[PDB]
Design a protein around this ligand. Structure first.
Ligand SMILES: N[C@@H](CCC(=O)N[C@@H](CS)C(=O)NCC(=O)O)C(=O)O
Ligand SMILES: N[C@@H](CCC(=O)N[C@@H](CS)C(=O)NCC(=O)O)C(=O)O
Lengths: 254, 254
């Protein structure tokens, strides 16, 4: 009767957890110390599971509703909640004696932050990270993932997005680096070079960063040349942020 | 012996104030209740005056330092501050007995909000708003403005950017409208539909919106069809935000 947490398995790590969006929620559940069970769902099975547990789609597009993980279902409440930001607000509200991740006065600014973060980071990560995460998916997720991502890119095959050693890949990295350079400026805009957005207390905004960053580390690989370069950017700010949350970087087989 | 506030004069209103970026600081000074004296600078003189008074350039691109208004000089302290967000931070620390606009635990989220806002609003406004502000600049500024902006747009004359009745202008408006829709989403992301980002207290994020919005109202004109349509967007949230700040929508006679 614990909270049920829906995740997509991958082969990047033995514990199977790789997704940037589900890591945001997994970090959230771990940081709040709330117990949960993990339910593993292949990409093509996501919509039929959501329909079957009553999860709202996270956006409605031309061709219909679009279902994503993370989803949690809270049996203590009956509620099914989809989207990591919505899950964070739900957990803040339903388990108020856990550490708050979105203090109410910062709620709107957190929603502004998620947009600024998508533009500066998610869009730049894609040409390198999506072909990489595709290469570690189970066969039925690869079929679905390749087909849909290649289609959303106009038909450009993943292998052509940014081949190793190419200049496409090299300029993808430069825009990635610039993106994280912007987050570095936000975190030091008043002269005080912070690791956390609020200063001393963890916020969902920090959980957002480490969620996307642990995705890079785990899929590119901790010993990959590109990841070890990444650890040195902005005097290792991003490596350091990961370290702070390492106690919460946990996939309980239990 | 008062703070000197450097602004760009225009003809859209009697009081000569039109700039989106200087209104952010003009709202900021008025809301904080700090006395100051405006001194008007035409565009082609901005770089020359900044050098004269020791103002930092607000950004540095390969082709040189880039000097912008607003700027303030504080004879009380001897300091010259450029960039509206830097001015607000400077005024917060330097006059602590005035109402704070950037609470320190929200400082970094304010800097992400500035990026989120630029991306969502500023670029969308440009095809419609840069030509309209050109038409109300004094001739020394019009020469400089039309030249630099037409050049920055590949040679397209301002009158062709989004002319009235065109489909270019219709699609520019839908992009602007959707941009303000995301701010509406951020202000109500927790289901509490706010007018102010912090909830009940004014913050520089709120000041950022009205400085850009009052630029649209003054330069398109309060009676223009386009502005009166703008007042109806999002059940009047942006009109209502202007109303909240009408007290401080003042160019003091001084
Ligand atoms: N805004 C959502 C994004 C969720 C999302 O994109 N999830 C991906 C996994 S990383 C997914 O389930 N993909 C659905 C699909 O592509 O079919 C959140 O933050 O939860
Ligand atoms: N980031 C700056 C932007 C200021 C800015 O771009 N100001 C314009 C007036 S709206 C300017 O002075 N431009 C000078 C030019 O185009 O030469 C701020 O927020 O203060």
């Amino acid at each position: 009767n614990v909270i049920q947490f829906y995740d997509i398995p991958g082969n990047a790590t033995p514990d199977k957890a790789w997704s940037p969006n589900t890591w945001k929620t997994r970090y959230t559940l771990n940081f709040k110390g709330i117990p949960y069970k993990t339910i593993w769902v292949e990409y093509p099975d996501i919509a039929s599971v959501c329909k079957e547990i009553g999860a709202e789609p996270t956006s409605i597009r031309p061709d219909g509703p679009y279902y994503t993980l993370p989803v949690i279902h809270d049996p203590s409440t009956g509620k099914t909640i989809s989207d990591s930001a919505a899950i964070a607000r739900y957990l803040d509200k339903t388990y108020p004696d856990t550490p708050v991740v979105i203090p109410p006065e910062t709620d709107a600014l957190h929603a502004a932050f998620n947009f600024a973060f998508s533009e500066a980071i998610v869009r730049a990560l894609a040409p390198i990270m999506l072909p990489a995460t595709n290469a570690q998916l189970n066969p039925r997720s690869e079929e679905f993932f390749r087909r849909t991502r290649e289609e959303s890119a106009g038909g450009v095959k993943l292998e052509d997005w940014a081949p190793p050693g190419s200049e496409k890949r090299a300029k993808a990295w430069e825009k990635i680096r610039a993106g994280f350079g912007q987050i570095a400026k936000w975190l030091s805009a008043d002269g005080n070079d912070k690791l956390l957005f609020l200063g001393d207390k963890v916020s969902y905004a920090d959980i957002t960063i480490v969620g996307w960053v642990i995705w890079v580390k785990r899929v590119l690989g901790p010993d990959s040349a590109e990841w070890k370069d990444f650890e040195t950017w902005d005097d290792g700010k991003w490596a350091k942020q990961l370290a702070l949350f390492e106690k919460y970087e946990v996939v309980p087989d239990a």
